[PDB]
C-alpha cells in the first residue's frame, strides 16, 4: 500500500518550511523520491510524515541520515 510522506527541501539541517505530499510504498522509495525532486544545489532534503515527525534527511554528498523514531522514556 502507497503511505504519505512530506518531502521538504531546506537550506539548512535546523530549519523549516512547508513541503510537498508524495505517496510511496516503502521508506527506500521515499527517499529515492526525494533525492529526484530536490531542485538546488547545496540544500538538504527531508523526509516527515504528515504528523511532522522527522524520518530522514540527507546533505549533498552524504549519506542519509536515519532519525530516532520512538517518543522519549526516562531510561532511570
Known amino acids: 500500500m502507497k503511505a504519505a510522506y512530506i518531502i ?5 539541517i535546523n530549519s523549516e ?3 510537498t505530499q508524495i505517496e ?3 521508506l527506500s522509495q521515499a527517499k529515492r523520491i526525494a533525492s529526484k525532486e530536490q531542485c538546488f544545489h547545496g540544500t538538504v532534503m527531508r523526509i516527515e510524515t504528515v504528523n511532522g515527525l522527522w524520518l530522514a534527511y540527507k546533505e549533498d554528498g552524504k549519506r542519509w541520515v536515519d532519525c530516532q523514531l520512538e517518543h522519549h522514556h526516562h531510561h532511570h
Open 8 to 12: 521538504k527541501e531546506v537550506q539548512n
Open 17 to 19: 518550511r512547508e513541503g
Open 24 to 26: 510511496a510504498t516503502s
